[PDB]
Design an enzyme around this catalytic site. Sequence first.
Site, PDB file in Angstrom:
ATOM      1  CE1 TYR A  64      -1.771  -6.084  -8.236  1.00 29.39           C
ATOM      2  CE2 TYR A  64      -1.903  -4.923 -10.519  1.00 29.39           C
ATOM      3  CZ  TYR A  64      -2.455  -5.220  -9.222  1.00 29.39           C
ATOM      4  OH  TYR A  64      -3.896  -4.875  -8.867  1.00 29.39           O
ATOM      5  CE1 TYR A  92      -5.381  -1.666 -25.133  1.00 27.23           C
ATOM      6  CE2 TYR A  92      -6.630  -3.701 -25.273  1.00 27.23           C
ATOM      7  CZ  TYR A  92      -6.380  -2.403 -25.712  1.00 27.23           C
ATOM      8  OH  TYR A  92      -6.681  -2.182 -26.927  1.00 27.23           O
ATOM      9  CG  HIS A 147      -7.822  -6.381  -7.875  1.00 27.80           C
ATOM     10  ND1 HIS A 147      -8.745  -5.693  -7.213  1.00 27.80           N
ATOM     11  CD2 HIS A 147      -6.921  -5.686  -8.291  1.00 27.80           C
ATOM     12  CE1 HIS A 147      -8.214  -4.473  -7.318  1.00 27.80           C
ATOM     13  NE2 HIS A 147      -7.192  -4.346  -7.920  1.00 27.80           N
ATOM     14  CD1 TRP A 188      -5.765   1.738   1.293  1.00 29.64           C
ATOM     15  CD2 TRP A 188      -6.512  -0.221   0.729  1.00 29.64           C
ATOM     16  NE1 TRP A 188      -5.808   1.799  -0.075  1.00 29.64           N
ATOM     17  CE2 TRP A 188      -6.111   0.550  -0.673  1.00 29.64           C
ATOM     18  CE3 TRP A 188      -7.193  -1.634   0.662  1.00 29.64           C
ATOM     19  CZ2 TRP A 188      -6.261   0.094  -1.865  1.00 29.64           C
ATOM     20  CZ3 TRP A 188      -7.398  -1.973  -0.730  1.00 29.64           C
ATOM     21  CH2 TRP A 188      -6.966  -1.462  -2.195  1.00 29.64           C
ATOM     22  CG  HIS A 237      -2.195  -1.031   0.769  1.00 31.94           C
ATOM     23  ND1 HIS A 237      -3.124  -0.650  -0.212  1.00 31.94           N
ATOM     24  CD2 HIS A 237      -2.245  -2.338   1.415  1.00 31.94           C
ATOM     25  CE1 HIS A 237      -4.019  -1.866  -0.254  1.00 31.94           C
ATOM     26  NE2 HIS A 237      -3.373  -2.673   0.854  1.00 31.94           N
TER      27      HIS A 237
HETATM   28  O1  LIG Z   1      -4.986  -3.321 -10.707  1.00 30.22           O
HETATM   29  C1  LIG Z   1      -5.588  -2.599 -11.222  1.00 30.22           C
HETATM   30  C2  LIG Z   1      -6.671  -3.011 -12.182  1.00 30.22           C
HETATM   31  C3  LIG Z   1      -7.544  -3.978 -11.811  1.00 30.22           C
HETATM   32  C4  LIG Z   1      -7.286  -5.511 -12.086  1.00 30.22           C
HETATM   33  C5  LIG Z   1      -8.367  -6.586 -11.718  1.00 30.22           C
HETATM   34  C6  LIG Z   1      -9.211  -6.347 -10.916  1.00 30.22           C
HETATM   35  O2  LIG Z   1     -10.137  -7.207 -10.652  1.00 30.22           O
HETATM   36  C7  LIG Z   1      -9.609  -5.045 -10.453  1.00 30.22           C
HETATM   37  C8  LIG Z   1      -8.863  -4.030 -10.783  1.00 30.22           C
HETATM   38  N1  LIG Z   1      -6.086  -1.582 -10.539  1.00 30.22           N
HETATM   39  C9  LIG Z   1      -5.803  -0.920  -9.341  1.00 30.22           C
HETATM   40  N2  LIG Z   1      -5.760  -2.022  -8.523  1.00 30.22           N
HETATM   41  C10 LIG Z   1      -5.561  -1.431  -7.179  1.00 30.22           C
HETATM   42  C11 LIG Z   1      -4.856  -0.159  -7.062  1.00 30.22           C
HETATM   43  C12 LIG Z   1      -4.344   0.307  -5.567  1.00 30.22           C
HETATM   44  C13 LIG Z   1      -4.091  -0.620  -4.668  1.00 30.22           C
HETATM   45  C14 LIG Z   1      -3.508  -0.361  -3.497  1.00 30.22           C
HETATM   46  C15 LIG Z   1      -3.564   1.130  -3.019  1.00 30.22           C
HETATM   47  O3  LIG Z   1      -3.304   1.475  -1.850  1.00 30.22           O
HETATM   48  C16 LIG Z   1      -4.121   1.928  -4.008  1.00 30.22           C
HETATM   49  C17 LIG Z   1      -4.506   1.503  -5.204  1.00 30.22           C
HETATM   50  N3  LIG Z   1      -4.702   0.505  -7.815  1.00 30.22           N
HETATM   51  C18 LIG Z   1      -5.013   0.223  -9.225  1.00 30.22           C
HETATM   52  C19 LIG Z   1      -4.844   1.165 -10.498  1.00 30.22           C
HETATM   53  C20 LIG Z   1      -3.427   0.749 -10.902  1.00 30.22           C
HETATM   54  C21 LIG Z   1      -2.714   1.810 -11.748  1.00 30.22           C
HETATM   55  C22 LIG Z   1      -1.358   1.671 -12.029  1.00 30.22           C
HETATM   56  C23 LIG Z   1      -0.914   0.219 -12.270  1.00 30.22           C
HETATM   57  C24 LIG Z   1      -1.736  -0.840 -11.758  1.00 30.22           C
HETATM   58  C25 LIG Z   1      -2.943  -0.517 -11.073  1.00 30.22           C
END
Ligand SMILES: O=C(Cc1ccc(O)cc1)Nc1ncc(-c2ccc(O)cc2)nc1Cc1ccccc1
Length: 190
Positions: free
Chosen positions: A189, A137, A174, A91, A21
């Site tokens: 990731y 993508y 996720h 969170w 996070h």
């Molecule tokens: O990873 C994603 C996309 C996603 C994939 C699968 C799914 O089930 C739901 C979403 N998005 C995401 N998912 C989580 C977070 C996130 C996680 C923790 C946090 O503290 C803040 C943002 N941010 C993001 C945006 C992001 C930007 C750049 C690179 C990767 C991802």
Amino acid sequence: ASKYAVKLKTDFDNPRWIKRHKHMFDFLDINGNGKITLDEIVSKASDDICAKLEATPEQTKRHQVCVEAFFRGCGMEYGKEIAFPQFLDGWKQLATSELKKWARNEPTLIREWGDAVFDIFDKDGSGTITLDEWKAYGKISGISPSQEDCEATFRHCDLDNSGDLDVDEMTRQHLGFWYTLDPEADGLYG
Ligand SMILES: O=C(Cc1ccc(O)cc1)Nc1ncc(-c2ccc(O)cc2)nc1Cc1ccccc1
Ligand SMILES: [Ca+2]
Ligand SMILES: [Ca+2]
Ligand SMILES: [Ca+2]
């Protein structure tokens, strides 16, 4: 089936959960002032992601609404500057609440977000994400940052080894990565 199996127990005091996070907070803190706003989050985690995935306006609106709901569930708001320790507290509350919803068969904000992302990746509306759809993508959007990692993470998300991803496989991974520090989600990731 592993695609529907979610941990009942969080691990909020684990440094690895905190650091995941922390990495995101700093990534999303656009102006670098050590405080995060919902403006910055929506810009990086929604505006930029939808544009890079070539979402339609309707898909972008839907994904934005999900991200706003999700991050308001962490105490975020437009114009409200929040330092990391409070961000993390949000969170903690969110994960705890959503895991109770999951266990009670109530809808979750995280699954709604997953639906919105899945819809965009699934360009042909097949109900499945094939490796080609994912590779298209993965690196571009910022989710994978290598080809090796991209193909690995695809195999890692394909829980039932069908050769393609369904919305339940993706969402569960996720959720495992961000809520429960689930070891089965560790490669998501790369
Ligand atoms: O990873 C994603 C996309 C996603 C994939 C699968 C799914 O089930 C739901 C979403 N998005 C995401 N998912 C989580 C977070 C996130 C996680 C923790 C946090 O503290 C803040 C943002 N941010 C993001 C945006 C992001 C930007 C750049 C690179 C990767 C991802
Ligand atoms: Ca900031
Ligand atoms: Ca498809
Ligand atoms: Ca599969």
